Write a protein that binds this ligand. Structure first.
Ligand code: 5UT
Ligand code: GDP
Ligand code: MG
Length: 168
């Protein structure tokens, strides 16, 4: 059929995973989205002239790391590592998410993008420099987003597709 990318949105509770997903899919900001609901949504896009379908998995719920769940996560082709720029713990968590993804994929070369969300807030506690430097050490792109204003949303997901398209 037509080209498909499975993109998995990860990161701590409350960082804006669901809001980023729904902004990408239907261009509206959701204020309240149940943190236990993990759903996927598919969107037709055109990225660098190539039509494709993005299958976006908005991860949620309990943090349980089992063989079956690992194998399910392994079906993701690229991962958005999302933290919130006003939540230092969510940034500290990022390496844990990354290491679990590498483990399940049996690869140190998995397509990923680091996303600092909630850029519209007055309350930053994570410096852009620190997140850029982390992403550089990982060899992956860094995007800042606001699911509220939509700034950076398409850049984050389309950058992740472009990372997948490099992947050997
Ligand atoms: C407040 C709820 C919420 O938004 N979230 C909890 C946090 N994660 C949800 C998804 N999750 C798991 O399902 C644990 N299993 C698991 C996850 C991964 C990832 C790191 C998500 C890719 C992998 Cl690779 C394997 C397995 O088994 C973690 C916590 C978001
Ligand atoms: N100001 C602001 N609030 C946001 C943004 N993204 C998410 N939120 C709010 O942050 C809370 C958590 O968002 P949610 O999408 O549920 O995060 P998730 O737990 O990672 O799925 C909600 O009240 C959202 O409306 C953002 O970019 N800016
Ligand atoms: Mg959610």
């Amino acid at each position: 059929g037509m080209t498909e990318y499975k993109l998995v949105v990860v990161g701590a509770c409350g960082v804006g995973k669901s809001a980023l997903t729904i902004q990408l899919i239907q261009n509206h900001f959701v204020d309240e989205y149940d943190p236990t609901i993990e759903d996927s949504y598919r969107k037709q896009v055109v990225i660098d002239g190539e039509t494709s379908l993005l299958d976006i998995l908005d991860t949620a719920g309990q943090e349980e790391y089992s063989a079956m769940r690992d194998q399910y996560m392994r079906t993701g082709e690229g991962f958005l590592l999302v933290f919130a720029i006003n939540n230092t713990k969510s940034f500290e968590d990022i390496h844990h998410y990354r290491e679990q993804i590498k483990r399940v994929k049996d690869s140190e070369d998995v397509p990923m993008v680091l996303v600092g969300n909630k850029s519209d807030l007055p309350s930053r506690t994570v410096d852009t420099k620190q997140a850029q430097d982390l992403a550089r050490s990982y060899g992956i792109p860094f995007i800042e987003t606001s699911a509220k204003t939509r700034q950076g949303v398409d850049d984050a997901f389309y950058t992740l597709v472009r990372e997948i398209r490099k992947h050997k």
